[PDB]
Amino acid sequence: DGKLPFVLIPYMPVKRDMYGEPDAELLGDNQAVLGAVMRGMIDLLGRSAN
Amino acid sequence: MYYIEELFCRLANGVLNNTGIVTDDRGDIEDDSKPFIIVAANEALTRLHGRFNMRNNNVVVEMQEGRTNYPLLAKYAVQSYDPNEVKCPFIMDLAGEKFAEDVIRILEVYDDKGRRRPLNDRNNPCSLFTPRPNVLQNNAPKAWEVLNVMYQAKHPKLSTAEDGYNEIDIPDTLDPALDAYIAYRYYTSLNTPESSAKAAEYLSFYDSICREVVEYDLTSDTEVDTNTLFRKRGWR
């Protein structure tokens, strides 16, 4: 072949760049917000007398 | 900020002008009845410092091994203590005014390491306890542990005796409340129906002034701060 034996496969390509972006880049804030709501619901039920 | 002498002159030329407890020239109170005003004055100042968080003071307590209860009394301070009775005082007031024994309610406790020690937390193993309002209890005194206690402090006790405390430090807007309360005790002590009706009016006036202060918030009693739970809960 006469060149490097490595192959690059990006997931979401970046304009004029090698490394792509995974799905975790866009969902950073959404996961944190969702986690806060779930913990709040459990705390309301868990700490309540029953 | 005025001395105790001006209080007698203000009362003589104020609410108590008509009564016979003042001198002929209405310039001072009789020496035979000065302690009567002092008892009322001490009572009035305690009530004001309870309703309003005017004064906040902090003390330094040095832990001593073998002792779990640390009363906040004057005789345990480094100043004005008996070396014959207590061998080593644990309350340090080396600088500034002496410890006046004016503890009402403990607010927060911080140690020398810079952290916050939980107070009256029964489920917390390392929390302090207060079996009495003016007594601080530690269940594990260490070698060099030193505690700082922030508490709501009342005004120091006034006394006409020599080398006593004879200065009044209250906000000037509460002066009418002080005079009304003192007059209330004087008139209600006469056991006279004419004076009893007058005494009730002064008590209502004292309460009216206090609620006026709360309504307009002249003492800055309220306190708010930036919310920190937003980051603690991870809302982001």
Automatic annotation (TrEMBL), chain B:
Pfam families: SU10_adaptor (PF24175). It comes from the Viruses. This is 30 kDa protein.
